[PDB]
Write a protein that binds this ligand. Structure first.
Ligand SMILES: CCCCCCCCCCO[C@@H]1O[C@H](CO)[C@@H](O[C@H]2O[C@H](CO)[C@@H](O)[C@H](O)[C@H]2O)[C@H](O)[C@H]1O
Ligand SMILES: CCCCCCCCCCO[C@@H]1O[C@H](CO)[C@@H](O[C@H]2O[C@H](CO)[C@@H](O)[C@H](O)[C@H]2O)[C@H](O)[C@H]1O
Ligand SMILES: CCCCCCCCCCO[C@@H]1O[C@H](CO)[C@@H](O[C@H]2O[C@H](CO)[C@@H](O)[C@H](O)[C@H]2O)[C@H](O)[C@H]1O
Ligand SMILES: O=c1ccn([C@@H]2O[C@H](CO)[C@@H](O)[C@H]2O)c(=O)[nH]1
Ligand SMILES: O=c1ccn([C@@H]2O[C@H](CO)[C@@H](O)[C@H]2O)c(=O)[nH]1
Ligand SMILES: O=c1ccn([C@@H]2O[C@H](CO)[C@@H](O)[C@H]2O)c(=O)[nH]1
Ligand code: NA
Ligand code: NA
Ligand code: NA
Lengths: 401, 401, 401
């Protein structure tokens, strides 16, 4: 059922291709091989499982160190006393999760100043272009997207963006949509999402993004080819992380509020058709259950899984994770299998949604203002490609689990 | 005493008119007739009272739905447990009131994307121009101001602003000053201000604003005549609401702190004249009590009412409402009559203050940069006109109550 | 030992001078005389101690008035109940300290609108230029820096900045680096730092900054020679203070988190050399202990003092004060002498750090865009000069204490 899932996902991409005959079998064959093998290595092979576990524990340690800054600012409100007083409601999201975005943004900026990020990206991106035949720039952007967000990753190849082929630009877009970022990864981890899955999905996003970019927009043209000190670097990162944290916080207040209002209205509207219990989650579960089943979620869990996967696609993954997180605790409304939890975790791990197009337009567009028309034109296809990559990663994860 | 109040308010406007002889009796006669009749309909007439009550309950429901987003972000800190632990101080303004500005800003942006706002505005604005003979653009801006703020309302007629007559521009300014906005309305509602009064004052602001704009600046010239998707729209609204919420929060911290400092100084200064108990509230109550009496506040409550009305005028209505709100609870320093509470609520319901001029200069001015000189020149008169509109609405409300 | 400290500090500046032969003995002799005498007057002379105490009590009163705005916004979370529930962790830094930056920024803006700041600055700056022979503009900027921050102080002489001599510009830079600002002073006071020391250090920064600016960059060229209302002024100040408060909060979360991560890594790295207990504080204490000893800290307290002084220099003074503050309470890890507490307090009281260069580049540079190259070139020397001024003030304070 998983292998059928993989075939259908690949087939959809081929059906949507700008030119199926231009599809490079080495590129897309190798890309799928890498995404599949990467998953096999770290989710199934003992030595790989241990490397993943080791990496994840380090990430967990870094998060905990960063929480010392949070503890200073908010004191008792992020202490154990909160759970005694308020019970479950003692976990204040605004103080527990959002500040991690600030710390990690500062850390990443420091690692860029020190040249550490560039070193890792150069190695991974180099391996990708040699194996796949993808261009230098698009391969580096794909690798950068493992660690940073869709508008930050292309910065490592910013002078090459204005003259990128349409296929290159599309791949750059897909690499961002198929992945997340270090900051929010730590946020999702703080919400209870398994770090191993997040790290695995992040790394798998690089070949996965190239896979579906090159299936849906094969190359038909010919491609071509700093802060004053480390403290300034950290400060710049903290500032950017602050803006992100404020925006995420405002988005969540509004979007979760709007879903509640939508459910209030759907209840009244549904009542006209004998369904006063109608809610957005029900519509999404009903609509997306076949997709969840297709990627390997058991029949009796596909509807609940569909709620989260659907919400990620029609809104964004942060809102989706916010609703999925309770199902990872002991107080879960529905106790899901460990394979279903994993599949959902992987399928949600991406910036692939329609609103990300506007973000790419501004961020990626500022890097090449004459290409904004191209970005807008390819936006929906890029979101589909990114969605397919997330789904494929989830299917693969479901397979080896 | 109320009818004398109305006459005096109208008379002040005539005295201040740019040209009393140019005053159109159909326009200003009809405008007052509408504001008066609207008040009669929804505050006195049974069917109207029920429509107002019905509308207000829906608004109350929407607020409650939006608070689900707040609950997610701040958890226990906006739960019932807070009142057990901290008593009255368990109500954290920053978390209870300010986030509502974010949710409603997102909602309004969604309703604009969907064309719902434009539909309502087109009907109300159309009714106004046909009845009053006011221009198309200024009538639409007046109607828009019922729902959105002074810098947002003119956006519905933004290409007509640069070539507006001085009278039109003045009316656009007055419509914003005479009203509030959906976001802060929900904020004031969350503070305990009766939703019915806020909704009534908002609707009454549209004819009221035109009434005093056309009394004080009659037409002497001849007038003339988008986000990519709904999710982007919501996000844009949340972002704008976030900025508003942060600014309101900072303003309140500073202004309430400055009033405390001012009172500290006034105590020392007053002591020199045998009045060590001197405070800003006393000065304002003393100065504005005749105005409160004039609009229908009983003699023995006019001084307390004057404090709030005065504070609204010399600072802004948010600060005023922040100080008035305790008088709406059981722990009120002075138990005021229901008519006085209503009168104060109406009189405070407007952006009419001197600081709003600077806001109009930036917001409305960006729509027509060559008209910034005009905006500055007419600023004080526009604030007076807006104040008169609020006072008239309060007098009318006091009449039918 | 203190007089040797003063001599060494002066000597370092002479060694680093752009031209020792161009050093004006009247200027630098008088500047040191003023900084020394000011310290004698307010820290030793009874009448001066009483003026300082009186000024500090007023500042303390103003802070308390401003906290009424904080109380309104955050209610129970800044009440005495917090200490009952959470103990020491009941003091929430984000709500107790950061909002004071907002109130004071609004207050300062009001005092500028009213002409009060300009009056005081004119008198102090006038006294400085007449006594020292320093130029009008650089003397006014030095005096302004007593009250406002490094990018705000030059605004009082902004049309003279583009054509300043290199020596003048350097002095303007040094005056900002040698001092702090009214907003954060109130923040540091709220953290437990003695107001008397903060006020004393602020005033001593004006001659101290000129002293080391004129020692290290003597004049070799020839020098030359608004909000609509008070409510707008307050609002503008609140807005600027809000941005500062958000940035300081984000910086603290990130920097304190990064120090924790650094200590995690140093523990592992140190372990390789038989020092698993290695931390950043130990490195800094070891590196800066001789400097602390030099300025008058007793041998057995110099290492602990070095931690704070070192942290201020390599990061910034806010982070330094955040770590020093616990040592001012009863729960201090090490009970330090009152003289050591004072010396540390003075030595930390300055914006002198490398990151402040980037801030001067933006803020001061916008005032004279053609001088940004000069600012960058003189940045490190200016930070050294500012550091020397702070150290000299601490040595002087240690002397009379
Ligand atoms: C909160 C939970 C409720 C869920 C509700 C889900 C509703 C989803 C609406 C999607 O709307 C479409 O979004 C596209 C993507 O932006 C828009 O394309 C616009 O932008 C595209 C990419 O820029 C272009 O291809 C199109 O031409 C341009 O119409 C299109 O107009 C718009 O109708
Ligand atoms: C916190 C509670 C304490 C309450 C204190 C109340 C003090 C109120 C001060 C009002 O000050 C006036 O404000 C006008 C409005 O901005 C200014 O006009 C300025 O702007 C107007 C409109 O732009 C122009 O008409 C004027 O020419 C221009 O002077 C005017 O200068 C200023 O003196
Ligand atoms: C968190 C606690 C851990 C503490 C770590 C302490 C590390 C301190 C690093 C200082 O780094 C130097 O900073 C200078 C100051 O910015 C830079 O000069 C840069 O800027 C100067 C002033 O603009 C110019 O003089 C220089 O030419 C230019 O290199 C210089 O490159 C950079 O190497
Ligand atoms: O670093 C980040 C974090 C978030 N987002 C946007 O915010 C949404 C929620 O995380 C994402 O889907 C994406 O559109 C980014 O663009 N970059
Ligand atoms: O949508 C809004 C909300 C507030 N304000 C300004 O903020 C003050 C306090 O609400 C108002 O008087 C007005 O000047 C606006 O301009 N628009
Ligand atoms: O008004 C202020 C407050 C802070 N800072 C910067 O923030 C750091 C921490 O207070 C300072 O060293 C300085 O670089 C300023 O520039 N101005
Ligand atoms: Na990414
Ligand atoms: Na309005
Ligand atoms: Na200063």
């Amino acid at each position: 059922m998983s292998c059928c899932g993989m075939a259908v996902l690949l087939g959809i991409a081929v059906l949507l291709s700008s030119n199926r005959k231009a599809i490079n079998l080495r590129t897309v064959g190798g890309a799928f091989a890498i995404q599949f093998s990467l998953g096999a290595f770290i989710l199934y092979v003992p030595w790989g499982q241990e490397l993943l576990r080791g990496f994840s524990d380090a990430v967990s340690n870094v998060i905990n160190y960063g929480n010392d800054g949070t503890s200073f600012l908010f004191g008792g409100l992020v202490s154990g006393k909160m759970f005694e007083v308020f019970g479950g409601g003692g976990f204040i999201f605004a103080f527990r999760v959002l500040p991690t975005l600030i710390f990690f943004s500062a850390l990443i900026s420091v690692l860029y100043y020190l040249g550490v990020m560039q070193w890792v990206i150069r190695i991974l991106g180099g391996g990708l272009q040699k194996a796949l035949g993808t261009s230098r720039a698009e391969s580096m952007s794909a690798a950068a997207n493992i660690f940073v967000g869709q508008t930050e990753a292309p910065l490592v190849v910013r002078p090459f963006v204005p003259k990128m082929t349409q296929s290159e630009l599309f791949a750059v877009m897909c690499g961002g949509l198929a992945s997340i970022a270090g900051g929010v990864l730590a946020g999702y981890a703080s919400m209870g999402v398994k770090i191993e899955y997040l790290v695995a999905a992040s790394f798998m996003a690089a070949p996965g993004g190239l896979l579906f970019a090159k299936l849906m927009m094969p190359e038909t043209e010919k491609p071509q080819d700093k802060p004053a000190n480390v403290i300034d670097a950290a400060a710049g990162g903290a500032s950017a992380g602050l803006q992100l944290a404020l925006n995420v916080g405002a988005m969540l207040i509004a979007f979760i509020g709007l879903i509640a209002l939508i459910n209030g209205m759907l209840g009244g509207i549904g009542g006209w058709f004998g369904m006063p219990e109608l809610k957005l989650e029900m519509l999404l579960g009903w609509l997306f259950a076949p997709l969840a089943f297709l990627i390997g979620v058991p029949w009796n869990e596909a509807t609940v899984a569909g709620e989260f996967i659907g919400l990620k696609t029609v809104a964004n993954e942060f809102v989706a994770y916010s609703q999925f997180a309770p199902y990872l605790t002991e107080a879960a409304p529905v106790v899901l299998s460990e394979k279903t939890k994993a599949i959902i975790s992987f399928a949600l791990c991406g910036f692939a949604n329609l609103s990300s197009i506007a973000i790419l337009l501004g961020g990626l567009g500022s890097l090449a203002p004459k290409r904004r028309g191209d970005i807008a034109r390819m936006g929906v296809k890029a979101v589909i490609a990114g969605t397919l990559s997330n789904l494929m990663a989830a299917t693969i994860a479901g397979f080896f689990l």
